[PDB]
Amino acid sequence: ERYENLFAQLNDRREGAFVPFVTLGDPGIEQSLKIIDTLIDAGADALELGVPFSDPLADGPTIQNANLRAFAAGVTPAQCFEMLALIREKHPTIPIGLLMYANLVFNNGIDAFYARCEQVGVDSVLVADVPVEESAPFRQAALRHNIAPIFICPPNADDDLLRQVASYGRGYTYLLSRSGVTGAENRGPLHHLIEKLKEYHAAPALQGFGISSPEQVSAAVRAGAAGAISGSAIVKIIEKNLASPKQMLAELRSFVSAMKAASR
């Protein structure tokens, strides 16, 4: 129960969680393992990791290019799970969540995909293109292998949906800041959803989409959410410093330290 422990510890500290996102193997396997270690060393509380897919239909330009850069280095799903195993062998307690598209988990059999996550030490799985109406087999498979199934609560959610999300999910509840796709390009009142989710005893909420500045994470915490996820802002620093690996890491450190400090 990686997430449960983290949240109890953070509450104990009256702290919010800062969770950065990156695509595995961007710009290369070796630089990626290095990027992730810098992320943790600078203060990340948990990790959201995507495996390269050919058609990421819920992602904006920045993340579309993250996938493109990983494809250019030949990064495959098998290579990803190898990376995942090594990441856990180095860090035993940090919660790890995978951002997945449906075909990559159905391809080889839904059950076997979740068996692999367990084997490697993955904590949760969010499948971007599966709504609750279609979640049964993914939900059942995750629970069977001690993997937490993550559900998305949109800003336009009705009581029936809130009740559903609260009942099925585990680990954390992905609270969408906005309508649309990923992108630090466009910024995204969620007090009512947070309280209703709290009323139905749902898993602690993590706000995602458009979070790119410190003021944004302190606001998420102030509203009642347990933390915030940031992706495009992280990925943009990688893009900016491709020619200088040393400069990339140094810049990644400054950004995540500042973001982590704002959750306090």
Binding site: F53, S54, D55, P56, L57, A58, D59, G60, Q64, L68, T76, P77, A78, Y101, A102, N103, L104, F106, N107, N108, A128, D129, V130, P131, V132, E133, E134, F151, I152, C153, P154, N156, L176, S179, G180, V181
Partner: protein, 387 residues
């Protein structure tokens, strides 16, 4: 939902949570529209006085000479726009308007769906946005220009392989942030429910007209109806009214490209693997690791890298049968119709003609009453066949 989203094991609603209310809204507007005689009369007027409905059913006497086969062609090439696609877009555009929408989003590969969406939007006063892969834009200057002349915005997608697949991605990305004012005019009988059901229903009239037509002229139903399958809309449009007539065969034709054996084809239903993508569970062109792949064909219009869920269903229960036809085989049927009947068929439709031609040639003494759906015009393909 009000209706079943699956056809056996296939179909579904695999989209991000944010788009689920847009699909429920659409479903409900469609159910209502179908029960409204006012909507029905309006759709029928547009079809008849604007599109050219009903289309002819032509007997092809020269081509079948010397055999025991009687062949008829459903003339969808005579529909306004030169293709069957037009029936669908008129109906979907009226649904968007019934829903209070003022904007249309559309995807296109070779340009045909794009041209159709643009003409329907101009006629019914809707603002049209069209996504096209950069590689296809470069390859399809005439259609891109026709679209712009019709008042539509054309947007090149440079991501991924920069083809149909990637345009399909961009359209949903856009819709997830604009669904409140814009309607997504999907181009084939695929994607998330209710699209496969709606596209079928707004394409039903092809087979419905064919029945009355063959009954009048031959006093009997056909032994089989044949149609090409890129995404599945013209085929299901033809099949639908005949599904309950057990004695009538239903045959769908997928592109074989350079040969199935070379791995250079566009036949996922028969030679692909079932996957989940584009809001659907269906057979798909895919790598071993599950990365989505491109479809290949001499005809640009048969490049949707998957297939409609109702076809995958009709196939599994044995109601319909599916086969494939190679580039050279389609070129041959194209050449033959020009020469013997005075009709230039689209390279897409030529795949269906080619299979009916095989059925004849292989067993010339078999008594057979055949109907091929000529989904479109071939003026489009003159320079391709030339070079």
């Amino acid at each position: 939902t009000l209706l079943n989203p699956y056809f056996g094991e296939f179909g579904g609603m695999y989209v991000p949570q944010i788009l689920m209310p847009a699909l429920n809204q659409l479903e409900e507007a469609f159910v209502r529209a179908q029960k409204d005689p006012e909507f029905q009369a309006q759709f029928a007027d547009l079809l008849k006085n604007y599109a050219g409905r009903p289309t002819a059913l032509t007997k092809c006497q020269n081509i079948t000479a010397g055999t025991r086969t009687t062949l008829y062609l459903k003339r969808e090439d005579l529909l306004h726009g030169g293709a069957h696609k037009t029936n669908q877009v008129l109906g979907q555009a009226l649904l968007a308007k019934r829903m209070g929408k003022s904007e249309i989003i559309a995807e296109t590969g070779a340009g045909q769906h794009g041209v159709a969406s643009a003409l329907a939007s101009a006629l019914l006063g809707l603002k049209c946005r069209i996504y096209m892969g950069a590689k296809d834009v470069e390859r399809q200057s005439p259609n891109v220009f026709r679209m712009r002349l019709m008042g539509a915005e054309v947007i090149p997608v440079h991501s991924g392989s920069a083809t149909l697949k990637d345009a399909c991605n961009e359209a949903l990305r856009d819709w997830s942030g604009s669904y409140e004012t814009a309607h997504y005019m999907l181009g084939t009988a695929a994607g998330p429910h209710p699209y496969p059901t709606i596209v079928r229903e707004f394409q039903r009239m092809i087979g419905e007209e064919t029945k009355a037509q063959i009954l009048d002229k031959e006093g009997r139903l056909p032994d089989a109806v044949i149609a090409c399958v890129g995404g599945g809309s013209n085929a299901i449009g033809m099949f639908a009214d005949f599904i309950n007539d057990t004695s009538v065969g239903l045959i769908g034709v997928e592109p074989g490209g350079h040969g199935i054996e070379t791995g250079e084809h566009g036949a996922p239903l028969k030679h692909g693997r079932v996957g989940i993508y584009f809001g659907m569970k269906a057979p798909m062109m895919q790598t071993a690791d599950g990365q989505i792949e491109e479809s290949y064909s001499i005809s640009a219009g048969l490049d949707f890298p998957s297939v409609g869920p109702q076809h995958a269903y009709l196939n599994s229960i044995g109601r319909a049968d599916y086969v494939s036809i190679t580039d050279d085989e389609a070129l041959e049927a194209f050449k033959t119709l020009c020469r013997h009947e005075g009709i230039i068929p689209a390279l897409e439709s030529s795949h269906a003609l080619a299979h009916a031609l095989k059925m004849m040639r292989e067993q010339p003494e078999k008594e057979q009453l055949l109907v091929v759906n000529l989904s479109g015009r071939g003026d489009k393909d003159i320079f391709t066949v030339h070079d």
